[PDB]
Design a protein around this ligand. Structure first.
Ligand code: FMN
Ligand code: FMN
Ligand code: FMN
Ligand code: FMN
Lengths: 353, 353, 353, 353
């Protein structure tokens, strides 16, 4: 019985070791955040437009000016290889088959170059800055291997307090690898190569990365650049002012700050203020959640745990199945609300509850 | 202990096979819709008018200009024969004994002509359009057999995602029949009779039926015409503008779109805007639910599952009993709020919570 | 462990037959009303006034111009003799010992005259009109035996639909008696005495008793007259306009109409509009509930089930104990909010939640 | 698994006798107050400021003009010696090691002088007035032994109705001592020394202590003076007008009046009106609760049960551990919301829910 995302979560929980399941499903502190991320979608209900010809519907849409099958993307998640063998490639290939982008994490188990060599879909790279020099190395690496878009994740200045991991003394799987940091030499001694090595021997990232640092990254990267982890129209607007081509409103799936607002709470305001592409994630499970955000102005929605449940439960085929269900879900919803063309979605189809 | 509608649901659940019970009780996806349909009635409470002579009360009222015993109707539901033998006739006869209309579904188990020959009450016909030509055949059939009112159901452009059925692999009972589509020939070959046969071999309806298509239906039908499945004052008004004599605000009992608003949410607005008869269904179980809608301007309320629980539990007598309880319920409520004549109901008896 | 009203309810439930307990605790239909009656008190919280000398507090107050120990009364309840032997007298004597009025029901087990002969406290009489002539007989009977105040209950035009009784086929106890209707002759034949006898052979009251009928009652009774069962500032005001000296906002403890508003919802408005004594009941269990109503302008609060739990659990002593706890409760609350004199209570001590 | 305050409560409940645990955890009457104290923090969520350099954070802050490690204090609680041997000293020493003040209760198990002789941290004294003369004795005693700040608790004019204690017939432990009242002589006879002895033989305090009485206390004490137990901007302002250097908004951890508002409800208003230091307690358990109050203008937050769980569970080390977790918690939160310097907190980081 695999008819929705919840069905896959249930199967994933039966197949994954508890420690791994908790690493995936867990949130920060009391987990009021993940619950809120889900609950907030109930603040909106649909007001369908009847007697509209929906015999011919289209989910196709442009994201950052480029067309894709539907306004979805498989977002950046670390240690996918812990959920399923070659998880990164499984996810990437399922996304490509579906006609949507896949975003590779800086903490992926498969390197930037290898995935680019094994998958010819639209690949994006999510950047975490631990060491400026090292980050610059990954950015150029992604540029030269053909990644089309760069995503800077800014909501991990410090690691989230996820108590499930603390209780399980969660340790990154033994057979796993932080490939992107592989071969970053050593044995060298001097300012850097000593200041760099010590930065790599730390589970914390660059907590000083600021606006000036963003400009730096902006000149380094030539293609589309998005800033991820924003929770205010003000920051979204500032990013556009600094060179960003768009943003990704997100609270990291409730894994960083338990009492953070849901990005859905500032979506409309960010769309109205920035006037630029506003993507979003955190809490999406049903096709209706997705349609509600799109109707509020979101350019696209990134999937986090949703597609990971498919991966952990049934590998690549599992990811394919979740994407198939979600697309049909989105399609079905568009038909029932009377909006045949997804790009025609507006707040007019919603009712504030 | 059969003192209310819930008591009949309980009995129906004990007597029906789980698959059939789930077909009846089930809703779309998470079933937040059916729960909302019930919960929304709690947004209103009564402010009784004391010291009013209610020794002589009247539930009689005009619906579309024609008088009936009370502002209730047994709405259109498919496969009633799966709940109880000759369910369609049981429901029709109970409605007639009570003095209210019965609406026959396009997917009923007893044909349009047979029911008209076995029941002389006020019979209405609910139309689903799968094939324009076939629909025209049923419409004329209903006209010639004496049906007084036609109801166009517009909220099934696509089938609702009801997961209970998916889990039970629900298949329309073997002893059941889609009588109205009986004898629609075959063996014929050409444009239609090939385009028509393929349409009949599909569980999906005409998703292209639009406003122009409604005008078409308007000229075809001479008597009262209602459009069912509306969830906005705007669409209700548009229907009146296109020829409709009234509308039926409904979310199909939460069986089509889980996150749809409850029709109660747009009832007052639809009444104020259209200035025409506004009927409503979805979520009604208690006499108070009914009185609240009537007080907000509804012309009448259609019963869906309420009377079906009586049917599945105790057949025709069961339907009679539910209608008797509801009428006494409505009567009792009118007395306790100080409104002896049902047609005197106004929002003045309500308090927004 | 009898430290509050809930503790007495628990004991009463252990000592009373289920049928009797359900007759007492039960409410109409779904019992959302009784739950609401309790929940509504949470819409207000206290904002204590610190550094106020509360070493000398007073709960004494005038009700309808007459002083009593505290702003409480034991309200009218029928069949008290079913909860405890000579329940009516037990309640009356406990009220008198506490220094507050006791209201006798028209459906009490002890007659108007007998209680007046066995209790010398402030006795009030609650009138139910089944037969005008019979009612007039009881009114004059109460006048001549020394009852100080008459209370007309207007919210029982029809009997409430209490399903607990239906399930238990609740029948008024065999050893009980409707004393006030005793000796109303028979064997007589003519217009009345035949129209009167048939009215007595009916469990329903005079559903036609209206405003004109109230004027009738107003001229018949010389002392203080209150109208009970009101749920709107408009009706409260109309009663004052017709001669009433005050009103009692009430929904009959949620026993008549499940979806009725709580009288607390119109308390402030009734106080502001009528400018006359506004008493109230329904849902009061804690001293804080009482203080909140008093702070909103209520002249006094009538106890229903609260003191009945004491009666059913431990008879007269039980009633004494509940009143003692409530008084100390009220006293304690006044001290903690900084309002030493109960007559100084105002909305300034409250916070709307 | 001791990763947060709740983990310590759980351990404390396993180690303490039920009667003692109930004395600590219990609240007044229905305990809706303690639940509300917790729930109210959910009315605010965070709106982090991204791309801010938080590599260098500071929790240091001035409280009443004096710098301390972080805006926290271990508030006044009675009978700490019942939770752990020499509990008062354990708490005082843990507070000092952490760099924050400890407030000694008038009902502590260790005397004013002894703690001052065994701990050289910033010690504050919380005053309860039972006898003016006796109170004056303690005040001067605290002054001469080096206590820096005096705190007048005004919300115990009468003892709270805590039913857990009533059910357990809670009696102050046999090995415990009300040290501060030790050696207050006897055997003396005359006005006082007879009026004083009778006051000491009473579990109730001076319910007459008013504004004039506060002026009296103001002239008696030369250093910083705070008034604790306020629940309105009006009273907070009045205290400043009477000489107070600041206030402590508090509902005594829901132990005095179950329906009292949470001090969080009047925090912003008190800050805006008084323009003086506004401290607060009641319901704080997570670092986020603390940060929310600080962001609303609170000078500091006093811990009650939070650090008591550490004490009862693991003594002094337990208190150290709770303070360490809370500090890291506060630090982590500041980083995740983009506010490196705690004194830079403003309502701009919050979202009203
Ligand atoms: C197991 C797991 C690992 C994650 N790793 C990363 C990462 O390496 N980079 C990043 O930008 N976000 C990371 N995220 C956050 C996601 O990109 C996304 O914001 C989040 O999962 C969205 O919420 P949802 O899980 O409810 O869909 C992770 C989330 C999960 C559940
Ligand atoms: C078993 C079942 C079958 C239904 N079949 C039809 C149908 O054939 N035509 C139609 O217009 N509505 C159909 N409906 C919807 C009803 O007309 C009505 O909108 C709905 O049941 C109202 O909600 P309620 O069930 O809460 O009363 C069906 C509902 C149920 C429960
Ligand atoms: C067992 C029972 C019998 C009652 N009988 C009467 C009656 O004879 N006359 C009347 O005016 N109200 C009657 N009432 C209503 C009370 O006067 C009062 O409105 C109600 O109990 C107040 O609510 P509470 O029970 O929550 O306090 C009755 C209530 C109960 C619980
Ligand atoms: C066991 C216990 C004893 C207390 N004793 C006192 C006291 O002696 N003096 C005082 O001012 N407050 C006293 N308080 C109240 C605290 O100072 C503080 O207001 C309260 O605990 C804050 O709420 P919290 O427990 O949720 O942190 C006590 C609280 C508890 C839990």
């Amino acid at each position: 019985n695999l008819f929705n995302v919840e069905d896959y979560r249930k199967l994933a929980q039966k197949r994954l070791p508890k420690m791994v399941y908790d690493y995936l499903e867990g949130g920060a502190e009391d987990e009021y955040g993940v619950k809120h991320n889900r609950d907030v979608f109930q603040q909106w209900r649909f007001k369908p437009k009847r007697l509209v010809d929906v015999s011919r519907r289209s989910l196709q849409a442009e994201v950052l000016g480029k067309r894709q099958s539907m306004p979805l993307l498989i977002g950046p998640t670390a240690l996918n290889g812990a959920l399923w063998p070659k998880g990164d490639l499984a996810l990437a290939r399922a996304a490509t088959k579906a006609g949507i982008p896949f975003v590779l994490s800086t903490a992926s188990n498969m390197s930037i170059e290898d995935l680019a060599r094994q998958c010819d879909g639209d690949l994006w790279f999510q950047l975490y800055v631990i060491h400026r020099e090292i980050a610059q190395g990954m950015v150029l690496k992604a540029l030269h291997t053909g990644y089309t878009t760069l995503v800077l994740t800014t909501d991990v200045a410090v690691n989230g307090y996820r108590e499930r991991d603390l209780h399980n003394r969660f340790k990154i799987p033994p057979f796993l690898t932080l490939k992107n940091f592989e071969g970053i030499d050593l044995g060298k001694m001097d300012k850097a190569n000593l200041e760099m090595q010590a930065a790599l021997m730390s589970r914390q990232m660059d907590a000083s990365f600021n606006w000036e640092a963003l400009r730096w990254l902006r000149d380094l990267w030539p293609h589309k650049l998005l800033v991820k982890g924003l929770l205010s129209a003000e920051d979204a607007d500032r990013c556009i002012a600094e060179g960003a081509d768009g943003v990704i409103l997100s609270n990291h799936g409730g894994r960083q700050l338990d009492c953070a607002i849901s990005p859905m709470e500032v979506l409309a305001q960010s769309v109205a203020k920035t006037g630029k592409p506003v993507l979003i994630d955190s809490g999406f499970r049903r096709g209706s959640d997705i349609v509600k955000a799109l109707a509020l102005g979101a350019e696209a929605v990134l999937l986090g745990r949703a597609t990971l449940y498919g991966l952990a439960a049934r590998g690549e085929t599992g990811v394919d199945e979740v994407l198939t269900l979600l697309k049909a879900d989105i399609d079905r919803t568009l038909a029932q609300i009377g909006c045949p063309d997804i790009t025609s979605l507006s707040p007019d189809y919603l009712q504030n509850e």
